[PDB]
Amino acid sequence: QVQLQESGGGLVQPGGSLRLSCAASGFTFSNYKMNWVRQAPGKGLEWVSDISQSGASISYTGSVKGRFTISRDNAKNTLYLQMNSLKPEDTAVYYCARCPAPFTRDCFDVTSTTYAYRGQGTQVTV
Amino acid sequence: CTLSAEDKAAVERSKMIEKQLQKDKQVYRATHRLLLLGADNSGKSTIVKQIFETKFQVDKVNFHMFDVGGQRDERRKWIQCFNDVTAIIFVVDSSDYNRLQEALNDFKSIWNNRWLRTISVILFLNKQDLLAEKVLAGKSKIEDYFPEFARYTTPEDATPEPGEDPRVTRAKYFIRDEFLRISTASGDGRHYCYPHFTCAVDTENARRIFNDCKDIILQMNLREYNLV
Amino acid sequence: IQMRTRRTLRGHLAKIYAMHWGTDSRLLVSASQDGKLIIWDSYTTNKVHAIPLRSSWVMTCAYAPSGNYVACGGLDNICSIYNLKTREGNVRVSRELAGHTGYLSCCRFLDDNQIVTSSGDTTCALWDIETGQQTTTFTGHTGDVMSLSLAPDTRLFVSGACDASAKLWDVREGMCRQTFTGHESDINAICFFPNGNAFATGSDDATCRLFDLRADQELMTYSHDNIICGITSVSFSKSGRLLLAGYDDFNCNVWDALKADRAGVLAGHDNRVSCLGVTDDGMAVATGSWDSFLKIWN
Amino acid sequence: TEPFGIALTLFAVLGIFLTAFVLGVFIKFRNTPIVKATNRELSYLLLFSLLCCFSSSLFFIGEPQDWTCRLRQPAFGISFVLCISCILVKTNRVLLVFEAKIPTSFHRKWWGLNLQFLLVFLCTFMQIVICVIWLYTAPPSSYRNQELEDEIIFITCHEGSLMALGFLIGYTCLLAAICFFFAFKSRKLPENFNEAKFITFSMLIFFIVWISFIPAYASTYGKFVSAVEVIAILAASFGLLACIFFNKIYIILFKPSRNTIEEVRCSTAAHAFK
Amino acid sequence: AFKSRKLPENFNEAKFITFSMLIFFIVWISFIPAYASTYGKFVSAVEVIAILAASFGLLAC
Ligand SMILES: CCCCCCCCCCC(CCCCCCCCCC)(CO[C@@H]1O[C@H](CO)[C@@H](O[C@H]2O[C@H](CO)[C@@H](O)[C@H](O)[C@H]2O)[C@H](O)[C@H]1O)CO[C@@H]1O[C@H](CO)[C@@H](O[C@H]2O[C@H](CO)[C@@H](O)[C@H](O)[C@H]2O)[C@H](O)[C@H]1O
Ligand SMILES: CC(C)CCC[C@@H](C)[C@H]1CC[C@H]2[C@@H]3CC=C4C[C@@H](OC(=O)CCC(=O)O)CC[C@]4(C)[C@H]3CC[C@]12C
Ligand SMILES: CC(C)CCC[C@@H](C)[C@H]1CC[C@H]2[C@@H]3CC=C4C[C@@H](OC(=O)CCC(=O)O)CC[C@]4(C)[C@H]3CC[C@]12C
Ligand SMILES: CC(C)CCC[C@@H](C)[C@H]1CC[C@H]2[C@@H]3CC=C4C[C@@H](OC(=O)CCC(=O)O)CC[C@]4(C)[C@H]3CC[C@]12C
Ligand SMILES: CC(C)CCC[C@@H](C)[C@H]1CC[C@H]2[C@@H]3CC=C4C[C@@H](OC(=O)CCC(=O)O)CC[C@]4(C)[C@H]3CC[C@]12C
Ligand SMILES: CC(C)CCC[C@@H](C)[C@H]1CC[C@H]2[C@@H]3CC=C4C[C@@H](O)CC[C@]4(C)[C@H]3CC[C@]12C
Ligand SMILES: CC(C)CCC[C@@H](C)[C@H]1CC[C@H]2[C@@H]3CC=C4C[C@@H](O)CC[C@]4(C)[C@H]3CC[C@]12C
Ligand SMILES: CC(C)CCC[C@@H](C)[C@H]1CC[C@H]2[C@@H]3CC=C4C[C@@H](O)CC[C@]4(C)[C@H]3CC[C@]12C
Numbered sequence A: 001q002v003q004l005q006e007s008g009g010g011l012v013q014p015g016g017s018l019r020l021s022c023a024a025s026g027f028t029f030s031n032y033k034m035n036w037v038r039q040a041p042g043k044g045l046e047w048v049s050d051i052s053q054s055g056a057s058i059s060y061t062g063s064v065k066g067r068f069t070i071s072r073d074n075a076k077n078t079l080y081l082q083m084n085s086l087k088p089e090d091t092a093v094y095y096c097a098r099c100p101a102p103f104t105r106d107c108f109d110v111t112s113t114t115y116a117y118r119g120q121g122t123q124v125t126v
Numbered sequence B: 001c002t003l004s005a006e007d008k009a010a011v012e013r014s015k016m017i018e019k020q021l022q023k024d025k026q027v028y029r030a031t032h033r034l035l036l037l038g039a040d041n042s043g044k045s046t047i048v049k050q051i052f053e054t055k056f057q058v059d060k061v062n063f064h065m066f067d068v069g070g071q072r073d074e075r076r077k078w079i080q081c082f083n084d085v086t087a088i089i090f091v092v093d094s095s096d097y098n099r100l101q102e103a104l105n106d107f108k109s110i111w112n113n114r115w116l117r118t119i120s121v122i123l124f125l126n127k128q129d130l131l132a133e134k135v136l137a138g139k140s141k142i143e144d145y146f147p148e149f150a151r152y153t154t155p156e157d158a159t160p161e162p163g164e165d166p167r168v169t170r171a172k173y174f175i176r177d178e179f180l181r182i183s184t185a186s187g188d189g190r191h192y193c194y195p196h197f198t199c200a201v202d203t204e205n206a207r208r209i210f211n212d213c214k215d216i217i218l219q220m221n222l223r224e225y226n227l228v
Numbered sequence C: 001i002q003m004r005t006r007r008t009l010r011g012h013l014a015k016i017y018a019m020h021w022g023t024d025s026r027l028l029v030s031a032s033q034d035g036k037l038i039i040w041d042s043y044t045t046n047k048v049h050a051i052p053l054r055s056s057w058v059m060t061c062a063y064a065p066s067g068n069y070v071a072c073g074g075l076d077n078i079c080s081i082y083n084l085k086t087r088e089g090n091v092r093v094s095r096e097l098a099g100h101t102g103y104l105s106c107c108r109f110l111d112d113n114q115i116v117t118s119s120g121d122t123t124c125a126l127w128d129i130e131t132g133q134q135t136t137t138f139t140g141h142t143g144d145v146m147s148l149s150l151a152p153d154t155r156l157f158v159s160g161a162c163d164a165s166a167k168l169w170d171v172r173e174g175m176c177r178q179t180f181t182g183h184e185s186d187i188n189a190i191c192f193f194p195n196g197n198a199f200a201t202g203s204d205d206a207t208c209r210l211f212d213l214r215a216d217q218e219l220m221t222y223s224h225d226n227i228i229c230g231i232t233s234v235s236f237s238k239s240g241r242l243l244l245a246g247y248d249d250f251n252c253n254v255w256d257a258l259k260a261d262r263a264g265v266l267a268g269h270d271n272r273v274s275c276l277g278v279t280d281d282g283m284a285v286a287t288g289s290w291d292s293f294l295k296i297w298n
Numbered sequence D: 001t002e003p004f005g006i007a008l009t010l011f012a013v014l015g016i017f018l019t020a021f022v023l024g025v026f027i028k029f030r031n032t033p034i035v036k037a038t039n040r041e042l043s044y045l046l047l048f049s050l051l052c053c054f055s056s057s058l059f060f061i062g063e064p065q066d067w068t069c070r071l072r073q074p075a076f077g078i079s080f081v082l083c084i085s086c087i088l089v090k091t092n093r094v095l096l097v098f099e100a101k102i103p104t105s106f107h108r109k110w111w112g113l114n115l116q117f118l119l120v121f122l123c124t125f126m127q128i129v130i131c132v133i134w135l136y137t138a139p140p141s142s143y144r145n146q147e148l149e150d151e152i153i154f155i156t157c158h159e160g161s162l163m164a165l166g167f168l169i170g171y172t173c174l175l176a177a178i179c180f181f182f183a184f185k186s187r188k189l190p191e192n193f194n195e196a197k198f199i200t201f202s203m204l205i206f207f208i209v210w211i212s213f214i215p216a217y218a219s220t221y222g223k224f225v226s227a228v229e230v231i232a233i234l235a236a237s238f239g240l241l242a243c244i245f246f247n248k249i250y251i252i253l254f255k256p257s258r259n260t261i262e263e264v265r266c267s268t269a270a271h272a273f274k
Numbered sequence E: 001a002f003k004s005r006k007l008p009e010n011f012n013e014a015k016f017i018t019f020s021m022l023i024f025f026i027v028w029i030s031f032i033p034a035y036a037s038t039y040g041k042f043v044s045a046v047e048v049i050a051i052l053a054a055s056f057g058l059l060a061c
């Protein structure tokens, strides 16, 4: 069964740092592109970052450019997100999303309301 | 012919069915089909003044446009139905900076989709008047959402419409360049993007679609004969 | 296992999504996005009926076991039942079933007055055609339901959805008996083993899997390192010894179900193999592709 | 051994070398936009036919023998028709490509590739039928003329029937006229897909060079007769080898930045806008 | 003329001048062996043809 578990969230003062982790199971982790998404109160899902299979290709959204960084350990089958200089608007529930099909670059339906290959998320408050 | 009389009559019936199919073949192959995409608040409903389907006519050429809206949020599966269409018409609201990154991500997803790797995209950057008013007002700043705007300069080939402000032109061409740089990374010459600036009062959209479809057909024919 | 193309059925204008064999093992129905269904006579390669549709975007079609009706549906969220045998002499729409909130992805007849449908609104339904109403609604999938397979005894049926999940349902009560997992991506096709105690699923994982109802778990996997494309359709032979699966690489593979060893390839199409079927007497295999062609292999 | 024969042989060998060089350049850059735009297979066939044209020019020189007098006229008559047929088919295909207004031609790759050669073979086949009828009914021969002068013996070729030669010339001129019409139609297209230099070749080689040799062919005897033949042949070949390839070869080797997909795309878009 | 063959002056006159001069040179280079080969009363004919061809060239250009 496809399982994604997020961890590493809480309340941190503005200007601090926080490390999010996502443990994946039930599939070949090295075969899929991965994404980090967030949902803020009173707002819908918003794509944040993504990393490809080999990790060569890394992309961010505008607000997190430079402040955050994404990485993945395929040997450990885990995804990491480092969060630095946390602005007060970074408060949200964070999800680690998996792209629906392997060996592909397009990733449809990662910011959808009901996506199967997502997780429970971690609350980050600034 | 080693056939019975009823077998021969069945053959004749099949022949008549084939004739009708050939007539339908001519009719079907005459008409161009377009797929209309773009989120809400973009105004994709009113782009042609001529809602699941729409017919319109431009100089003895028939266009048939489809807007799929009666489905769920996920579009991973049914989108495959539209891989024979001549063009995807993507409408983007050009005044809202809060949801423009979502439009960029959607355009990226459409552009790099496996079953949409040969379909060209006509890009309509709608609501130019609102963008111009917001830029001249100064309340909103593109730099807040796009830091790259500071280290940006207007294109050399950029055209100013008669009477305008350089800041408005800079904003417009930055918005266009975002989609263009998305579009010029995996196209490989198989499909292209045609961006346009259109307001709500604009009535030239159908002609732009006609010209873009002409170009799409020419490129497809060149590639099929293996000349490009 | 070498098969050859005995018949090639030409006449559709666009990509073919669905096909279905008749119980007589001679007549079949196919569906294209041009907006037409065609009933083909396989033996003579003759067109018996050409039914224009009110909606071009059709994704499924079924043939009634009696042979008096056909069904179709698609992006219009409607299941249309056409009566083949009328005194006037032409096919006319018999019923227009409405109620799904998403595209109709599959439909199968039980008899002349019952049909089971799966939709993109993550649910299935059992209908009464005379009243045009849903007698039962099956819920529980958290993603689009792609294919369904009725049991030989027409008591149970499975549905596979875009959540790496298959579900077993009882039609009379309307509850999910068991849930099967093991795939990593969306299930695109599903089919029972002939005796009814097992079924096979194909997915975007590029693997097929065999699940047994009594053991409540999978028994065999079918994949190769070269294969990286997903399975669009899957079917069993008459005896269940061979498993036939069409892929996005424009080819169909034949698998030794009991040994998970590939035994042959059907390679005649030049585009995606969208639909696949095996006759009720196990005498021929029909494959329809996006290149607007349907072929018979024997 | 004569100086004039040496000069003609050197010119023919030089033409052969240039044709081989052009063919090798086209093979090397076989997957570049400029070479793709000009149909590859028809270009290869045309270059082979030009090599055949120079080889045919090589038949006239020497002491005339029966088989040489038999083979000399049909060789060039077939090779030139093959070249013209290749040009004609290429222009017709590009015209059909640029005049289509429908989502797709749906023209099969193998079907189009085979159809091109099939049309070329139709034209060459009519020529071959004429030549076969001629060589079966009235073969040309060799002949030791001892009537032109008193001190001299002229070893020449006697044409079996002047009507057959007239038919070959007439068919070649008819095919060239058809090719001229089609090339004149395809002048508004982008410069990479044009064949408007065939007009230049026809103007400079058919109406000036070949015209000016009519009196020489009208009343002359002995080696000079053969001379005119060879020279005429060479002219056409060289002109064709120029008007179709040299410019493109230049752009392929020198000014390489114009051999890019973007340039061709821009030119095609400019054609679309107009 | 070839130096300024791309200048658009006078409806792009230089290209036509270049073509006319090319026609002239081709005519006389072909005239040399044609005259050397002609025998008899036709030796004047070639001259006329040349005198025609070149002349027509200039006009048509
Ligand atoms: C034994 C009988 C021989 C007959 C042989 C004739 C063959 C057919 C005639 C063709 C012809 C001769 C006119 C003859 C004059 C008549 C007698 C004159 C006496 C006085 C009465 C008519 O030339 C005409 O020229 C017009 C003037 O420009 C032009 O008009 C246009 O412009 C208007 C202006 O703006 C505009 O307004 C109008 O709308 C337009 O249409 C016409 O399109 C064109 O047909 C010349 O054709 C031209 O030939 C060129 C080759 O040099 C050829 O270029 C090719 O090669 C070049 C070099 O390799 C290369 O550089 C070029 O890239 C390449 O393309 C041109 O393609 C071809 O066209
Ligand atoms: C569309 C345009 C380019 C038309 C193309 C036609 C040319 C290829 C034709 C037209 C007139 C032909 C010429 C007309 C007459 C003669 C006379 C002929 O002379 C003889 O046959 C010798 C006298 C005899 O034995 O009767 C040699 C070929 C030649 C030069 C022909 C060569 C080819 C020409 C120039
Ligand atoms: C023995 C001698 C007298 C041979 C006769 C040659 C000329 C008197 C004729 C032969 C072929 C004729 C040409 C054949 C084809 C054309 C193409 C034609 O072009 C079009 O009409 C196409 C227009 C388009 O569709 O774009 C204009 C006349 C022209 C130049 C003709 C002009 C006169 C030519 C050169
Ligand atoms: C053995 C000796 C006596 C040879 C004499 C034959 C000449 C009359 C021939 C041989 C080479 C021929 C030339 C070979 C190449 C060309 C290139 C050609 O150039 C172009 O067409 C340019 C194209 C453009 O305009 O872009 C013009 C004809 C011409 C001069 C030919 C005209 C006739 C020539 C001078
Ligand atoms: C053989 C005897 C019976 C008479 C001799 C006449 C020919 C030698 C003359 C008559 C018509 C002349 C032609 C008339 C017109 C032209 C158009 C001319 O075309 C251009 O120069 C236009 C180029 C451009 O448009 O830029 C080239 C020369 C040519 C073929 C002339 C070449 C010489 C020709 C064939
Ligand atoms: C009589 C005539 C036709 C013989 C033609 C021979 C010349 C033109 C041919 C013979 C073999 C050819 C070579 C074969 C293979 C290659 C490798 C390719 O990556 C670059 C071009 C190159 C190097 C070719 C250039 C053209 C070539 C040298
Ligand atoms: C537009 C098209 C049809 C024009 C085609 C004209 C061709 C077929 C005509 C034009 C002038 C003709 C030539 C005129 C004179 C002679 C001399 C004769 O002793 C042999 C045939 C020959 C050589 C003719 C062959 C046919 C010919 C070349
Ligand atoms: C009689 C024959 C063998 C001489 C061979 C010389 C050839 C190789 C030379 C002679 C003059 C040269 C041409 C002179 C001018 C131009 C114009 C330029 O814009 C493209 C190249 C082009 C077209 C040259 C190509 C090469 C060329 C044709």
Ligand SMILES: CC(C)CCC[C@@H](C)[C@H]1CC[C@H]2[C@@H]3CC=C4C[C@@H](O)CC[C@]4(C)[C@H]3CC[C@]12C
Binding pocket: D242, E022, E025
């Ligand atoms: C037997 C020998 C002397 C023949 C020599 C032929 C000379 C006169 C020919 C051979 C190649 C020809 C060149 C080939 C190509 C071009 C390009 C064109 O756009 C202008 C004319 C120009 C520049 C030609 C001028 C004349 C030229 C130099």
Ligand SMILES: CC(C)CCC[C@@H](C)[C@H]1CC[C@H]2[C@@H]3CC=C4C[C@@H](O)CC[C@]4(C)[C@H]3CC[C@]12C
Binding pocket: E002, E025, E028, E029, E032
């Ligand atoms: C009377 C006859 C035989 C003289 C023949 C001389 C020929 C071969 C000479 C005379 C004039 C010469 C041309 C004079 C000017 C130019 C322009 C230059 O940019 C390239 C060379 C080129 C194109 C020459 C090529 C050779 C040429 C055509």
Ligand SMILES: COc1cccc([C@@H](C)NCCCc2ccccc2Cl)c1
Binding pocket: D072, D073, D076, D077, D168, D169, D172, D173, D210, D211, D213, D214, D217, D228, D229, D232, D233
């Ligand atoms: C196209 O005309 C031909 C068809 C076949 C052969 C031949 C040649 C090889 N022999 C006769 C030569 C005819 C001739 C005489 C003077 C000037 C030009 C020409 Cl052409 C010509």
